[PDB]
């Protein structure tokens with residue numbers, strides 16, 4: 213059934229966790245070293 217997966221997508225805590233992961237995955241991009249490739 214597609215109803216079970218639909219409820220999780222349109223949830224209150226699931227959409228917050230995926231949103232805080234997006235703004236935290238960006239910080240992983242800013243911390244990279246551009247000079248030393250092998251670090």
Ligand SMILES: CC(C)CCC[C@@H](C)[C@H]1CC[C@H]2[C@@H]3CC=C4C[C@@H](O)CC[C@]4(C)[C@H]3CC[C@]12C
Nearest residue numbers: 233235236237238239240241242243244245251
């Ligand atoms: C968890 C991620 C996505 C957000 C936090 C990222 C920052 C705060 C973390 C990610 C990897 C970490 C680095 C991993 C390895 C080292 C080498 C060590 O000799 C000095 C600290 C240093 C340089 C860490 C500093 C903190 C660091 C840059």
